[PDB]
Amino acid sequence: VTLCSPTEDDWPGMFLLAAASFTDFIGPESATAWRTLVPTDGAVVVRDGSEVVGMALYMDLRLTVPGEVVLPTAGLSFVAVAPTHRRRGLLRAMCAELHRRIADSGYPVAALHASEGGIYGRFGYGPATTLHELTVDRRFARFHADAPGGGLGGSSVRLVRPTEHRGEFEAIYERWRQQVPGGLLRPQVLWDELLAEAKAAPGGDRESFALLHPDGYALYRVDRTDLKLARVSELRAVTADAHCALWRALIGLDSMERISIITHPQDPLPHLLTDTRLARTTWRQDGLWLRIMNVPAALEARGYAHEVGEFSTVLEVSDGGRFALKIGDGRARCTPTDAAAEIEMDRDVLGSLYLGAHRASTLAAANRLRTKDSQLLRRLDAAFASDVPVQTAFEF
Amino acid sequence: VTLCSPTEDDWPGMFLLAAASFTDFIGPESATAWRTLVPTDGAVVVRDGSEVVGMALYMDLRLTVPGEVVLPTAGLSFVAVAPTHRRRGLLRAMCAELHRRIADSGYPVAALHASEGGIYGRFGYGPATTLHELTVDRRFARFHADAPGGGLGGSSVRLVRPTEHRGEFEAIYERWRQQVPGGLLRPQVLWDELLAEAKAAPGGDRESFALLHPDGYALYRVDRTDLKLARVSELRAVTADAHCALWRALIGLDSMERISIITHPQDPLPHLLTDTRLARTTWRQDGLWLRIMNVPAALEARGYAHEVGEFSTVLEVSDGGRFALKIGDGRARCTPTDAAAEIEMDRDVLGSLYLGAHRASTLAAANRLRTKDSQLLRRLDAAFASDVPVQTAFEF
Amino acid sequence: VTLCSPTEDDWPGMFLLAAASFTDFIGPESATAWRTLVPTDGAVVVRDGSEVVGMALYMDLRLTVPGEVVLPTAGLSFVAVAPTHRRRGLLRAMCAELHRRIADSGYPVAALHASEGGIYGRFGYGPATTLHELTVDRRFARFHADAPGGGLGGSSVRLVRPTEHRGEFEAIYERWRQQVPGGLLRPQVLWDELLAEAKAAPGGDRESFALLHPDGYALYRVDRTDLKLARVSELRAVTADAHCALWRALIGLDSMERISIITHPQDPLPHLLTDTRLARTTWRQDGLWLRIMNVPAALEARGYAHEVGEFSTVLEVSDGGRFALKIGDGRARCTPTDAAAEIEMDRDVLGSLYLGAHRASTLAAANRLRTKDSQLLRRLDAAFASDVPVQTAFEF
Amino acid sequence: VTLCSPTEDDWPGMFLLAAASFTDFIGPESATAWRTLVPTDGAVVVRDGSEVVGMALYMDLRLTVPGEVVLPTAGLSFVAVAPTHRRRGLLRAMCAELHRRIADSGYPVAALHASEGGIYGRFGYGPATTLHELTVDRRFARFHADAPGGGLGGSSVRLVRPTEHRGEFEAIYERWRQQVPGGLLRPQVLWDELLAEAKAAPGGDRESFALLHPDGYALYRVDRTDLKLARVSELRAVTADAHCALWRALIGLDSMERISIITHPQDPLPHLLTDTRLARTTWRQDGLWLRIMNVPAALEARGYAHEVGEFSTVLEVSDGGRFALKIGDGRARCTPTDAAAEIEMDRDVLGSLYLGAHRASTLAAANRLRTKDSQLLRRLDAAFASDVPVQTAFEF
């Protein structure tokens, strides 16, 4: 049992562990596309002593944070321990080695999507975005008098085949990901994968259709088994007009009873209808998780709310440094100090605060965040809050 | 078909319409207790066409709003139109008469709980609190190292019979309702009703138990049919210590698989556990609805966030006045003006903003709230935000 | 094992067998009310091995048949064989003795409701009415422009407590039962039972309400467990106006999702709506079963369609006689003959034809009814058809 | 937005709208077969803006009506409005243009299958056949002593592969469709489609088998998911012997618990068993809808019951003409008049009466059909009644 960067000969063993570990594993030809996002020395394997019994890697990603700032991000992925080798500390050893490499490579943050909620807190990852499933009973749905795009003249939305309008989807997504906290650059290979996944599979998913607006798109398909349910796989809108117009078209799917979408807690959709209750929250879960690799680099890189006045404090991250934190005019300066801490938190808590999805006050009430000053708590809440609601780009 | 204040002789007819309209109607002896909260001229009936075919009333309530300010509130209730008299405008006529009386009596706000989400927007009511059902699979639940009250020594929480500790529940609730936006004064007659509802009914609900802390209580009962589900009917905690201690006791119900509670979106419970995902959001719905009766009185009465700097704007409420709104040092001044509006919204939208449960930005994105200045939007968001999370007291 | 008319001392043993045999058995005090409808020598018991191991009886009923003719009817009821004494021919021996007594007493017909569909055919009983469950999704229900009672002015329907309007229900039912094939006289004791069953039971059924029109009523209650389902236990309307007005009131139960009723296949309700499909048939089953005791007496007693011209044929009932049947001007003459049969059928088939619920052609296609003349088949179809649709009065 | 006959270049756009509108859309190569039934100028499209946002067409069909008369029928089909273009009156404009063309082409009737029950009434279509799902628990099913084909000697029914006996199915169907009201000519291309749909699809439907009698056939397959359910897709029998023999074979599927079939309300199957209740009605819905294009042509073309004596009346169809209607010796004469109307009905009601599936009395009780003479109602009921039960051929 030793820990190594895999050679080309290790990858068949890694795909076998992948197929046994991940139910949503497409296969090796699809795995080739994703592999292009793994940098040299981005992967570790554990061999027994010989077959692959553990693996983990990161992908080179670009993450948008508040203030429309784009950070180089290490996307932790393809993490698996063989069922034959549980409770040997293989995950701890693989995560320690990858974090060393990620830190040394100069990534200010790492990110992942968690298969379970109890694993990644102890490695410094905090849940940073919230997935919100809305199910609309579209048979009762009437748009409010106030909702945009409810007048005479033609529709701005077109029903199209996804594959024939790739360029338009790419361009709209690129605009979206740059202006929204949680946005990820989507490289060409992941557009290849998305559009291949949009065709009908024999005994699998039904054909996907697209609703296309100049400033937004929705990809949807009828559910495999519930033929009265339309599942929106992806809706990206750059303007309120685009968002409302796309939902007018979706509510116009007269053969469906229900439209479902995985969106974010601040989706304005319920407020577009005369009955806000028709847009039902059916499911809620942690989305992207963040580990702040470099506390001062991360805190200085993002923008803060201009509304809160200039303030100074001392932040201690448990086994992650103590800093003089000065926040004013929407910017932070974060410098080493040995002055007494006014705020303490584990590294995972800072990750959860970083994109504005969780309030310092809420984490303080659970004692995940310690201070004796409630004024400082209000100030942190307001400063770290995101003006543009935090959203989730795509799973990896 | 005429509209009148009911006489004592009308009430049997009103209880018949009540029994046919409300599945949760206990009966006349329980209705006597609630009736003590209805002021003289608090009720309207429509006679045919002669029997009661329509009724509506308000109760005298006290509602806590941000800044720990307590407002006299008209609680709209017992609203019903006979199934024989639908689509005759009876609801519109009853609501118009009660709103006249509520306004003339000097109530700054009216409030209600909506049986459907599509009815009350057009009468100026906006959803102002959010109900959030959490279901905890307590078999997997482990408290985080950071969570309070996880050391040696005795437990501060006692398992007690509700009826023998009425005084302690009342005193804890009174502290709670005064410091939390959405808090309602609970009069003696509603404590009588709550504790009568806590005993086992033959062929009905199981016996209720209480977990009692000096600074909090939880009332719970095992579900009628799912004998592995404990339903928390009410948990009120004045400190984080009390909240955590009560949840340690609830997770200690070793014969249950699941604990369910109707709480609020900022409940810190998920952050008390090593796996935040174990506290699942199973249900989400509008709680209390507010109609702002007097815009300047309501806006001047509540506290605003001290963090946002002094700012001035002009707010138009659709058919509800135009005001010069100046917000600074956590207070608002709201005076008549004919100056050009910078913000427009229907009266229901203001109700939805008033306790801090909805962001101006979110309502703006649905065009329920119109402005050409995005800086003003950020300022409204921050100013109307509530430092203490908004919660829902009790249904009426 | 001997077969006897029960003495007063046998009835406790009969109530024990009743409680073990019938899940819907209320108890002895309710059984006293029903017993008043059992004539002297109306009951047989089998003693062992001495306790009651078998019982059967008939009640004196009045059944309306086509032409508004009311026949004395023996209502077979309370039929049970102990689980300890199956397959000893106890049912055959009890039915043979009761049929002897019913025939000798001068009843032209016997009737029953079958606990199973496979038992009573061999004793000469044929299913004669069809139960049809309609479930209306009332949220989508809009009345057609053509539907009666959709104008200005007051409602003719009142929401009332059943017990306070007994006289009106009785009078409407009496009019209904006299003009509808399948109608049964409902004696005072069964009105006592119906109205006692209309009150809420602790851990049982919810309170019943009534919708009252001068020419119709509906009794309904919210379902025990599905609180969005209203169950109409009984709707009796003497005019189309009354039927439509009552359904307008039922569709006005705005707190319900669904209204269910057990009605008949020709219920006009689907045709009152713009979408006939909203009135869904969820359940269909045989209602009343008839045994024709005296073929000539039964055939001469009912009215026939005036539209079909005079015709003569020879009908053989298997081990029930051969008759010259002459049908003209809506009357039949049925006299003994030894002339060759043109129509043959078992006695159960004649029961199924008698109230017009089944077509001779349909039974002929199953070979339950034999003839070599298809013209005679068309003539029988038309003659036995009922102008007023056959309905089911109440179970016994 | 203009309305045109599509060119060959429009059809890819029509197949895209088809795939997005119809979940049961096979694809373009199958669509080629159906297209052969669309006459020149049989199709309209709406272009925006230019893509297809609306389409509708009719197919040239042959419909059997009472008296074994075969009418040229316009089969309305492929009707779809893009979800982006709802509530622009596109359906009304397309239906108006197609009805103009259908009327001018000399079709006496149009027909369709309705995706929803609330759409087509306002365009003059009435539901004219009733689909009846029977589910038989075949484990309890015993054939009555009277049922045909229950003796010694060989079986007349063979278990065969559908594709190897196409000629026999075609010949039996051709006999069936000519003698049954609701029968449709099935062209070669739809036999091609039916038999391609009878083979097993990877991840789809299981292999179909056929039971073949000289005078009938049943096509059945085991359900995708419920492996104890056999679904009869089609049973056509020309004689009672064939119908019973096929059901003896179906009840002989000893590895199944349940047999389901979509049949008609007069299916004699329940009467073939000792327990009629085993043949359960699980589902009921409108089948074929008719619009009478030419009232006198349609009314004169069908046969009427010979049993009812000659009678004369005046029928007004709302905005469809007033006619002197004389019915005698199974024929109608229908001539223009300005004499006072004795019967009034919308055009959709006449469609519902035309094949005998609905009684004039039932529609009169809903006030869809107005007269002051109840004798005339009885006469219409009897005259329009169908001697051979109305059935549904195949969906389009």
Ligand SMILES: CN1CCC[C@H](CSc2nc(N)c3c4c(sc3n2)CCCC4)C1
């Ligand atoms: C499991 N996980 C759950 C959430 C969804 C997610 C989408 S599919 C996917 N995702 C990947 N990150 C990869 C990688 C492959 S192959 C593949 N496939 C080889 C080397 C690089 C990583 C799949």
Ligand SMILES: CN1CCC[C@H](CSc2nc(N)c3c4c(sc3n2)CCCC4)C1
């Ligand atoms: C329906 N509604 C749903 C939500 C829960 C709620 C609790 S029970 C209740 N509530 C009332 N407001 C009243 C009143 C009665 S009696 C009663 N009962 C007579 C006069 C005053 C109003 C019940």
Ligand SMILES: CN1CCC[C@H](CSc2nc(N)c3c4c(sc3n2)CCCC4)C1
């Ligand atoms: C079972 N059977 C199913 C269908 C419904 C039906 C209604 S309840 C009922 N019905 C009766 N016929 C009786 C009799 C009693 S007691 C009673 N109870 C004693 C002597 C006379 C007969 C009950």
Ligand SMILES: CN1CCC[C@H](CSc2nc(N)c3c4c(sc3n2)CCCC4)C1
């Ligand atoms: C939707 N609808 C529901 C009920 C069943 C029905 C059977 S499949 C079908 N049916 C058609 N009428 C057609 C047509 C095509 S393709 C096709 N396919 C192109 C031009 C002519 C019309 C399908």
Ligand SMILES: [Cl-]
């Ligand atoms: Cl990005």
Ligand SMILES: [Cl-]
């Ligand atoms: Cl580990």
Ligand SMILES: [Cl-]
């Ligand atoms: Cl809106």
Ligand SMILES: [Cl-]
């Ligand atoms: Cl308060």
Ligand SMILES: [Cl-]
């Ligand atoms: Cl109203």
Ligand SMILES: [Cl-]
């Ligand atoms: Cl914690």
Ligand SMILES: [Cl-]
């Ligand atoms: Cl009677």
Ligand SMILES: [Cl-]
């Ligand atoms: Cl027996």
Ligand SMILES: [Cl-]
């Ligand atoms: Cl109608």
Ligand SMILES: [Cl-]
């Ligand atoms: Cl035909």
Ligand SMILES: [Cl-]
């Ligand atoms: Cl339209």
Ligand SMILES: [Cl-]
């Ligand atoms: Cl038979």
